[PDB]
Paper text:
DNA methyltransferases DNMT3A- and DNMT3B-mediated DNA methylation critically regulate epigenomic and transcriptomic patterning during development. The hotspot DNMT3A mutations at the site of Arg822 (R882) promote polymerization, leading to aberrant DNA methylation that may contribute to the pathogenesis of acute myeloid leukemia (AML). Here, we report the crystal structures of the DNMT3A methyltransferase domain, revealing a molecular basis for its oligomerization behavior distinct to DNMT3B, and the enhanced intermolecular contacts caused by the R882H or R882C mutation. The fact that the RD interface mediates both DNMT3A/DNMT3B oligomerization and their substrate bindings highlights the essential role of the RD interface in DNMT3A/DNMT3B function.
To provide the structural basis for the homotetrameric assembly of DNMT3A, we crystalized the MTase domain of DNMT3A (residues 628–912) with the SAM analog S-adenosyl-homocysteine (SAH) and solved the crystal structure at 3.3 Å resolution. The DNMT3A–SAH complex was packed in the P3 space group, with each asymmetric unit containing two DNMT3A tetramers. For the two central subunits, we were able to trace nearly the entire DNMT3A MTase domain, except for the TRD loop (residues 833–846) that reportedly undergoes a disorder-to-order transition upon DNA binding. In contrast, a larger extent of structural disorder was observed for the two external subunits, with residues 671–678, 710–724, 782–789, and 805–879 disordered or completely untraceable. Among these, residues 710–724 constitute the catalytic loop, residues 671–678-situated α2-helix is part of the SAM-binding pocket, and residues 805–879 encompass the DNA-binding TRD. Accordingly, the SAH molecules are only bound to the two central subunits, but not the two external subunits. In this context, the observation that the TRD and SAM-binding pocket assume structural order in the RD interface-present central subunits but become disordered in the RD interface-lacking external subunits implies a coupling between folding of these structural elements and integrity of the RD interface. Of note, residue R882 of DNMT3A homotetramer and the corresponding DNMT3B R823 are both solvent-exposed and peripheral to the RD interface. For instance, in DNMT3A homotetramer, residue R676 from one central subunit engages in electrostatic attraction with residue E820′ from the other central subunit; in DNMT3B homotetramer, a arginine-to-lysine replacement at the corresponding site (K617) increased the contact distance by ~2 Å. The two central subunits of DNMT3A homotetramer form an integrated substrate-binding platform resembling that of the DNMT3A homodimer within the DNMT3A–DNMT3L complex, whereas the two external subunits abrogate their substrate-binding sites due to the lack of a folded TRD and cofactor-binding pocket.
Numbering used by the authors:
A (entry chain B): 626 to 832, 846 to 912
B (entry chain E): 629 to 670, 679 to 709, 726 to 781, 791 to 805, 877 to 912
C (entry chain A): 626 to 832, 847 to 912
D (entry chain F): 628 to 669, 680 to 709, 726 to 781, 791 to 806, 879 to 912
The structure:
């Protein structure tokens, strides 16, 4: 209810990956004051460094971050995160659940988020977002919704991209449950994402079939095609001499860019826009 | 500005243990609410059931709380519930009122779990030969037809296994809360 | 001496690799009527197919190409080629020479070129080019110059790029020996070719660890190597290839500014966009 | 189109004047016989190393009617022979007779055999053993206080048997005979 110049957003991104959040914020025209990211995979760190010109401040393991660190590096306006899910997904029979293995990393989020929320009486806008997979134990989803005091929103990237990617999103971002908008930049069909000389079998691709035909033979998706599918700029992940398995793994763990765009869009009215 | 009876929140295995130690040390109790993990399925003293039913608003209403205890003499599930209850019961920034907590577990745990608990609680444990005891209590600062009323009900029940030597850890509470 | 409308160039590229010739011809604004390429590496074929929208007519092994094929697919205006040099380079001690191993592939060129030369009395412009390495046996170089009836021109890509790549070029292209032009697009220094957050140790790469990133040492990335050799960034980013495959394809490739320098005079002989 | 004239031969075959001897055996008039030989390093003539022979030399000494090469690594020999053949071949539109023959040993890499058959566009003639490629009528094959002292040995041994001569027999139906 007061007057002031809208200021650039301050972001804390845990489990940053290939810095999808910063890319989405840049694409929206939102000015980023600073972007502190916690990531351990060196390949993802190299991707972020090269593609965002070192603007990202890397702090390493999320478990090396203390509350004193959150207050000194802070304040923060937006806290985003997507913890690893190899111990949360039901497709893994050796899953250790939300509380053991790599699932317990989620609590780190719940830790730092509570270390980052404005103290009582601070009416400043503060937003947070936590993404994970839909294919998890109902006990684990109920426990996450208990710890975050919010119910998740289910968004499938197939509605805005060419990939069957349904994900749960907890958070307090404005209008998370609002209908997604299919714009013109959205490549809804897999054929739109393929390189020249290839033909797509299905309309959408899933994370035993090889989806593309090339000449007289069958083939899996290329990394550039996978980038177009997930909404990333072409050759986004073309750094660091990493193996093809490395690029495919990095893109597999990544968020769908149009989905995160849909989620981050309402932030344009709360911060400075270039 | 004057001593008042203690208010406790217990996630420990066995609702009795904490209140028993408190009555042993002779500390007045104005509120004691207990809950269990119950991971399988779903005036002063009260039992509230599954911890999965206890919300932040419940801690607010039942509160304020002065002591928060947890643990047991699957090691990750109960500690994180205890951490959530601690965060929900902590006094807000700017409330210098006393607030203590204690978490007991077995020494036979994964070293990863021990390091994680020490990190999350910002405190190093107390070894008692053997159990680990984390806490902010003074002294726990550590460096690095026509028959019986009873009838069977088909359940196993726990007990209070800790001796008054473990209550010696709680002993400093007598200097912070009213004693009868 | 007569009048006619300039027509698009017809090209025959043997040992095409990654269509360095087609890319150079497109960059120069020269209209390409037809581009028939002979290449056997499937990775290179995929690169050339994807990057040029299937404009390339791939005929496979150069040894499955006959003289009747040159007449029926012809006429051709330009014939370019760069045979493999693993049996020509003095670095390899197990080299088999020009006449054995993979060196004899050169003769295939010498074959098809003579199968594509305009017959006597045909005053039409016809150009050819054959590239290979400088580090070869003096006898093999003398033999190649004897077979092609031309002395080679030595061009080192270090003069217009950031790579110590000196090569021999035989051919009849106009003014091959003319001085090269260092333009503004030329990234002469290895630093200009690096991705963000890396520092170059040497001014030009000779392919130890050429770059320093943060506190560690590292070799050149594929995009950096593309910038070094004059290729557009992410040119070779198709086909789920292994990193070794990308480094191998870029190693065997021509330096783009050098081929541009060689092909530039062709603008006054054919139709230009 | 006109009366027969003597034959003119260009010989790179290992062993000099072997073809001259065979032509003398078959009684064919020879108006020119130029002979050369491949070397490791530096009206009937021997012109030395084939590396010194150019297209202009083939034009001056020419025209040629027969081109012979081979030996009773194999690549260098055949490829020098191919260069000489290409330089001596009549241009398109010249229907004048022009024959060639290339002999090698059967003991060769099968890759080399197929490469020679491809380059010469001809399948070989096996003779109990040597391989003979040629365009002579009959070789068409389907798909399979004394003077001498102190010098580096110059043994001119070369096999010119009647069967080998037989291959050259059709030549007497195209050129003048003494
Ligand atoms: N202990 C830890 N601290 C910080 N990051 C971690 C971590 N353990 C795993 N990670 C990283 O967290 C990532 C989760 S996958 C999510 C990545 C991100 N949401 C994106 O869209 O790119 C993984 O890439 C993994 O490298
Ligand atoms: N027998 C053959 N027929 C056709 N191409 C061949 C071949 N043997 C090898 N090659 C190809 O010839 C290439 C020679 S390296 C030269 C590549 C090209 N000049 C460029 O600039 O990209 C190699 O990539 C190899 O794949």
């Amino acid at each position: 209810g007061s007057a002031e110049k809208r200021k650039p957003i301050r972001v804390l991104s845990l489990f940053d990956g290939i810095a999808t959040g910063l890319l989405v914020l840049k694409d929206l025209g939102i000015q980023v004051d600073r972007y502190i990211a916690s990531e351990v995979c060196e390949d993802s760190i190299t991707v972020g460094m090269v593609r965002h010109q070192g603007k990202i401040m890397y702090v390493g393991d999320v478990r090396s971050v203390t509350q004193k660190h959150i207050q000194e590096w802070g304040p923060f306006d937006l806290v985003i995160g997507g913890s690893p899910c190899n111990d949360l997904s039901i497709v893994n029979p050796a899953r250790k659940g939300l509380y053991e293995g790599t699932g317990r990393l989620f609590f780190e989020f719940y830790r730092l988020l509570h270390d980052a929320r404005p103290k009582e009486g601070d009416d400043r806008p503060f937003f947070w977002l936590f993404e994970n997979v839909v294919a998890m134990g109902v006990s684990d989803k109920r426990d996450i919704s208990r710890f975050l005091e919010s119910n998740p929103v289910m968004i499938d990237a197939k509605e805005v991209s060419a990939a069957h990617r349904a994900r749960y999103f907890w958070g307090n971002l404005p209008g998370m449950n609002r209908p997604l908008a299919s714009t013109v930049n959205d490549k809804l069909e897999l054929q739109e994402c393929l390189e020249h000389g290839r033909i797509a079998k299905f309309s959408k691709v899933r994370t035993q079939h090889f989806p593309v035909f090339m000449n007289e033979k069958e083939d899996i998706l290329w990394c550039t095609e996978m980038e177009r599918v997930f909404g990333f700029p072409v050759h986004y992940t073309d750094v660091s001499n990493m193996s093809r398995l490395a690029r495919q793994r990095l893109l597999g763990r990544s968020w769908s860019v149009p989905v995160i765009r849909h989620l981050f869009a309402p932030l344009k009215e709360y911060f400075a826009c270039v």
